[PDB]
Design a protein that fits this description.
Number of strands: 21
Name: Light chain of botulinum neurotoxin X (res. 2-442)
Shape: globular
Number of domains: 1
Bound molecules: zinc ion
Entry title: Crystal structure of the light chain of botulinum neurotoxin X (residues 2-442)
Structural class: alpha+beta
Distance between the termini: 40 Å
Largest sheet: 8 strands, mixed
Keywords: neurotoxin, endopeptidase, toxin
PDB class: toxin
Helix content: 25-40%
Strand order of the largest sheet: 7-6-1-2-3-8-10-9
Number of helices: 8
Assembly: monomeric
Order of helices and strands: EEEHHEEEEEEEEEEHEEEHHHEEHHEEE
Strand content: 15-25%
């Protein structure tokens, strides 16, 4: 079955699963001189890099901002993740979260999909051939030793140490059916709480109706799975973050409006807000993806004259019929796979399978200060049950209640600078 590789941060370089990686974004001016960074292959084609994400315009400065703060629940600390002990803690936390995801069939299948679903390569001399859209470089002493396959690289957080995000490497392949390598910025220890109505908590006797909005922490496996759903969209080349869904009209628009949400986030979160999408929208999204794939099969796949392992990978990713030089899209099987990746795979549906509580709506009504939690302590967080550990009376979402003892308060200043954890 799918295997998760364990590592300690001080494990030696071997060129197989432990490398020093040149940043995928090394050619951008903002990234001159950065790296290489120690990287660990946790699952085939999935790499963990215990470093702050610092490689795009909006993540390049990790310092406390010098401009109006427009995320009132952010926490800044440019020194987080700069010691070997914090890097090993991060590595262990990501490994443990992935082990949790693998512990249910739906999560195992998601990880298998990301591992196997390589971007569609370019063709050279009749053969599918690898590019930097499908690989990372092992750099040693300013030489490239090898190029290793990669669909996903997971880093630590950007400037806001409690934020999470996904970035596709190349912007044309992210939305034209080819797909692109993805980077994820993830924080397993610094979490942003949310509100949900609940009635099983200590309450004053003079309160008649106890069922009210209470504060909860997310399970960081749900946080990561949300980003992994974005990754799947990026690997199949079916992202488009230029569309907004307007809740007032039920229509897709190409600019943000009063009461709207980026459509990629509406789908990736799922839940109640995706249950009333019109048939017009669904048909247009499916038809766009089908047309993009039909074009790639005729213009690129049918120029392949060399059968190699990359072609094997691609036929497992893309449902096709026919023979070399004359493939056609398998419409029924492509439709089934596409509707799974767009409408079945989402944070809300996955959380239900894991007995994890998530909020009702992607957009939160108010900011709540982040907390710190040591998820490596099995008494607080287990791979099989997360925070909601039955033997400790914390089933049925109760272990996610924010007043649980393992959720530690963080003090910050008015500029949102980290001061300390209150243990
Ligand atoms: Zn998202």
């Amino acid at each position: 079955k799918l295997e998760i590789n364990k590592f300690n941060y001080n494990d030696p370089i071997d060129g197989i699963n432990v490398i020093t990686m040149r940043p995928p974004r090394h050619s951008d001016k903002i990234n001159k001189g950065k790296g290489p960074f120690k990287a660990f292959q946790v699952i085939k084609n999935i790499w963990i890099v215990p470093e702050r994400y610092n490689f795009t315009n909006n993540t390049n400065d990790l310092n406390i901002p010098s401009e109006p703060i427009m995320e009132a629940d952010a926490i800044y600390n440019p020194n987080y993740l700069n010691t070997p002990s914090e890097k090993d803690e991060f590595l262990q936390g990501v490994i443990k979260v992935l082990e949790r995801i693998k512990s249910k069939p739906e999560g195992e299948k998601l990880l298998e999909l990301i591992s196997s679903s390589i971007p569609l390569p370019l063709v050279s001399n009749g053969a599918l051939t690898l590019s930097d859209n499908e690989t990372i470089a092992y750099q040693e002493n300013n030489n490239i030793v090898s190029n290793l396959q990669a669909n996903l690289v997971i880093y630590g957080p950007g400037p806001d140490i409690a934020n999470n995000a996904t970035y596709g490497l190349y912007s044309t392949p992210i939305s034209n059916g080819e797909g692109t390598l993805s980077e994820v910025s993830f924080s397993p220890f610094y979490l942003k709480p949310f509100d949900e109505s609940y009635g099983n908590y200590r309450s004053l006797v003079n309160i008649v109706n106890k069922f009210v909005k209470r504060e909860f922490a997310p399970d960081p496996a749900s946080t990561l799975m949300h980003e992994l759903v974005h990754v799947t969209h990026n690997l199949y080349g079916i992202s488009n973050r230029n569309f907004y869904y307007n809740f007032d009209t039920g229509k897709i628009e190409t600019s943000r409006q009063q009461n709207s949400l980026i459509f990629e986030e509406l789908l990736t979160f799922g839940g109640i807000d995706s249950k009333a999408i019109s048939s017009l929208i669904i048909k247009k999204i499916i038809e766009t993806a089908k047309n993009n794939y039909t074009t790639l099969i005729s213009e690129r796949l049918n120029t392949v004259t060399v059968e190699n392992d990359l072609l094997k990978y691609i036929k497992n990713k893309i449902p096709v019929q026919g023979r070399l030089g004359n493939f056609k899209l398998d419409t029924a099987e492509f439709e089934k796979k596409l509707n799974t990746i767009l409408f079945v795979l989402n944070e809300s549906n996955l959380a239900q399978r894991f007995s994890i509580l998530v909020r009702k709506h992607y957009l939160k009504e108010r900011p709540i200060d982040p907390i710190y939690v040591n998820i490596l302590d099995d008494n607080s967080y287990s791979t099989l049950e997360g925070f909601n550990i039955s033997s400790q009376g914390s089933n049925d979402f109760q272990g996610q209640l924010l007043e649980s003892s393992y959720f530690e308060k963080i003090e910050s200043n008015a500029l949102r600078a980290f001061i300390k954890i209150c243990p």
